[PDB]
């Protein structure tokens, strides 16, 4: 007979109704994504509207308990989540206008296509075309034309939409009794009302700044080496002491450097590593692929799947009659069920993605005995990182030798190890600085320090200042360069990638230390060790109850992030690049421009 008891009973009813409706929505989404029919989209919309209306109803009901006299710290978390999700705040007309703008931006930009110049016969979409354009095709003029087509005429007539959207979202953030929308994003990382491992919104910026300051020299040396290697390919557009152009990073959107692996790797005489040819000769199919992937998690001690997921969770493409857009994702069906959707082809990358999805589903099954608004990761990046680590620690040559596909005649050469480390470090070090730059600019714009007529100018200025990559052709303020990103168009949170990349090396270092492996960090395996599995299981079943600081300290003996495990991982390539660095240039200047 108390306010907390009343709140607990309310949560008891919530943790049944929400379960039912979320299961409905998950079934509808799974059926739509495995089977594309108009009536399937109809029931999708019906389920979405039902879920939105239900959340609105309970957010309206939440006024019974004032959010000031609750002490259990779990009911408080549940009620705060209820107040955060499902509460309509702004006026109906303003909300409708904002939602209309959001709907009219992303879908139209996705469906936008550019035709063959002076030839309307061919009009390639986003999925084909540019993927091969930013590939082995070395036509500088064609790549520049594609970049101009994908940037100029869309940023023009997309700029006003985002210019109104930022103001509308600032109005929404102010209406939600909050500070700037940057504060609203940082809110997810903020947890308070606890002793010892307390956090807030005024520490993440400083942590990011410190990590970037610590990591700068490694990226400096790596991109200097990349520029030195690339000088030979196109010695007509890059100054020796200038800046790199935008459209020669191997991808129009950047964010990844895996494409440039081809004409950058040293010691091409040493063969690479791949088992694709041997797989078909040994008669490997999708079922055996998934069984082999699951065998590792079985051996480490974690529970394996049941007569559910295996019978369900279609893994083979059923031709074109039941064609479906298949991006491998882990499905949380709900009410004691888990599924995986993925088109399967016999390739190393597909095997790696299968490992990633298996880790995702294993984690999601690991945490299940919690209320509805508690089943998630402590931070946004944990959910992806806990699978990224498992995917990473399976392509090691020791793991391949344990598997047995690789012939023993393969030689453990230091050159081969250097090449593998370079291949990994390309993507790993490329993904960080651009992400930090984009986040810094988006936070600066949302807070407010520059006007719209200087927005793009300041964009390009700080892009050259930090990233060191200059646009090949100067851009006016009518365009919107950041708007090209899909996640920018969908205004999804972007710091997740940086956080997970920072956390994964902490996890790997701690787990390898637990396994007590001797040698270089990359040659570390957990095939037979069980203490690492127990240490990870100590956290995988927690949920959102314990804060991220407490969980991370309990796992790795550290209350926050630190780049030192990453530096230790990259020490060998760091030494090799330091040895190679004898006829290169240190640092870069923004004085040079591609347009003279």
């Amino acid at each position: 007979s108390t306010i907390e008891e009343q709140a607990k009973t309310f949560l008891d009813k919530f943790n049944h109704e929400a379960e039912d409706l979320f299961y409905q929505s998950s079934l509808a989404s799974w059926n739509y994504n495995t089977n594309i029919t108009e009536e399937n989209v109809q029931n999708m919309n019906n389920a979405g509207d039902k879920w939105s209306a239900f959340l609105k109803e309970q957010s309206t009901l939440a006024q019974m308990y004032p959010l000031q006299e609750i002490q259990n710290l779990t009911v408080k978390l549940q009620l705060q989540a209820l107040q955060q999700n499902g509460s309509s705040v702004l006026s109906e007309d303003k909300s409708k206008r904002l939602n209309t703008i959001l709907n009219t931006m992303s879908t139209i930009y996705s469906t936008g296509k550019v035709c063959n110049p002076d030839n309307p016969q061919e009009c390639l979409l986003l999925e084909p075309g540019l993927n091969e354009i930013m590939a082995n095709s070395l036509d500088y003029n064609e790549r520049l034309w594609a970049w101009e087509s994908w940037r100029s005429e869309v940023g023009k007539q997309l700029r006003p939409l985002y210019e109104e959207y930022v103001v509308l979202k600032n109005e929404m953030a102010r209406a939600n009794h909050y500070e700037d929308y940057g504060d609203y994003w940082r809110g997810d990382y903020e947890v308070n009302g606890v002793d010892g491992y307390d956090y807030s919104r005024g520490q993440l910026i400083e942590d990011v700044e410190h990590t970037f300051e610590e990591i700068k020299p490694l990226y400096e040396h790596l991109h200097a080496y990349v520029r030195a290697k690339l000088m030979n390919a196109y010695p007509s557009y890059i100054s020796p002491i200038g800046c790199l152009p935008a459209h020669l990073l191997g991808d129009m959107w950047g964010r990844f450097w895996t494409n440039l692996y081809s004409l950058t790797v040293p010691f091409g005489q040493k063969p690479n590593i791949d088992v694709t040819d041997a797989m078909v000769d040994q008669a490997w199919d999708a079922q055996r692929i998934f069984k082999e992937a699951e065998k590792f998690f079985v051996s480490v001690g974690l529970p394996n799947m049941t007569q559910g997921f295996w019978e369900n969770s279609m893994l083979t493409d059923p031709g074109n009659v039941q064609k479906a857009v298949c991006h491998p994702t882990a499905w949380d069906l709900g009410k004691g069920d888990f599924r995986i959707l993925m088109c399967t082809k016999v390739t190393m990358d597909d095997f790696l993605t299968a490992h990633h999805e298996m880790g995702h589903i294993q984690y999601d099954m690991a945490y299940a005995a919690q209320p509805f608004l508690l089943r998630n990761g402590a931070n946004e990046g944990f959910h992806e990182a806990v699978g990224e680590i498992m995917s990473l620690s399976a392509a090691t040559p020791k793991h391949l030798k344990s598997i047995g596909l690789l012939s023993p005649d393969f030689q453990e050469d230091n050159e081969t190890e250097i090449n593998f480390l370079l291949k990994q470090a390309l993507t790993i070090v490329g993904t960080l600085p651009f992400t930090y730059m984009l986040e810094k600019w988006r936070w600066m714009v949302f807070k407010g320090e520059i006007p719209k007529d200087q927005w793009m100018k300041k964009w390009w200025e700080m892009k050259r200042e930090i990233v060191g990559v200059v646009e090949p052709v100067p851009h006016d303020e009518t365009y919107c360069d950041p708007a090209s990103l899909f996640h920018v168009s969908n205004d999804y949170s972007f710091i997740r990638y940086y956080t997970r990349t920072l956390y994964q090396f902490q996890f790997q270092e701690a787990l390898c230390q637990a396994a007590k492996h001797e040698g270089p960090l990359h040659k570390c395996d957990i095939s037979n060790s069980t203490e690492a599995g127990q240490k990870l299981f100590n956290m995988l079943r927690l949920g959102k109850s314990e804060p991220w600081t407490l969980a991370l300290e309990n796992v790795v003996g550290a209350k926050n992030m630190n780049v030192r495990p990453l530096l230790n991982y990259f020490e060998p390539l760091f030494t090799w690049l330091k040895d190679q660095n004898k006829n290169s240039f240190v640092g870069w200047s923004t004085d040079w421009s591609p347009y003279a």
């Binding site: 007979s1 008891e5 009343q6 009973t9 008891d12 009813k13 049944h16 039912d20 299961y23 079934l27 009901l61 019974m64 049941t306 007569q307 559910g308 369900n312 069906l333 009410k335 004691g336 069920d337 888990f338």
Partner: protein, 194 residues
């Protein structure tokens, strides 16, 4: 001699009753039945904490009690001597020193509907704890606030929810089958033997 009495209607009885009001069945004064107890319907559990049933037919007890219902497939551990949590302490309480056999087995194929089995209610809000071997059929709107009921709303809730079932569910949350065996005795013959 030349006669006996089976449990033919204990199973194969089609319609069951929810845990809302667990029904009670009883037999007496005729030959018992234990030979065909475990020759079909592979049981998920067979824990007989009262007396080992290997020689159950050797001894007898008058007026045995037989019960059956469908609740879940994972919370079977709730039905045990001295354990609480939703069902165990609010719908069907178990005596502390009771002696009997608890049998639970899975019949997901039979008792699931592909369009949604939404016709098996259960209670999770009762005023107080329950006494050993106590049932109830009461239907009153639950209240936990200063104001009276006068309908539903803030701090006004229905005392009943539903067991929505879907065949695509995983193991553990599917509707299993639960049967409970019990017996008593006073000055009388034991009335059920073999």
């Amino acid at each position: 001699v030349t006669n006996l009495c089976p449990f033919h209607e204990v199973f194969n009885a089609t319609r069951f009753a929810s845990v809302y009001a667990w029904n009670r069945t009883r037999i007496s004064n005729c030959v018992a039945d234990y030979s065909v107890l475990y020759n079909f319907a592979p049981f998920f559990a067979f824990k007989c904490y009262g007396v080992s049933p290997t020689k159950l037919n050797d001894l007898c007890f008058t007026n045995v009690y037989a019960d059956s219902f469908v609740i879940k497939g994972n919370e079977v551990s709730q039905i045990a001597p001295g354990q609480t949590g939703n069902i165990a302490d609010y719908n069907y309480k178990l005596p502390d020193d009771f002696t009997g056999c608890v049998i639970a087995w899975n019949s997901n194929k039979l008792d699931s509907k592909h369009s949604g089995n939404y016709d098996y209610w259960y209670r999770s809000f009762r005023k107080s704890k329950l006494k050993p071997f106590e049932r109830d059929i009461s239907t009153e709107i639950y209240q936990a606030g200063n104001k009276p009921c006068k309908g539903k709303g803030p701090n006004c809730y229905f005392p009943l929810q539903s067991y929505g079932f879907r065949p695509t569910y995983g193991v553990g949350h599917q509707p299993y089958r639960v049967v409970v065996l019990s017996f008593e005795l006073l000055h009388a013959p034991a009335t059920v033997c073999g």
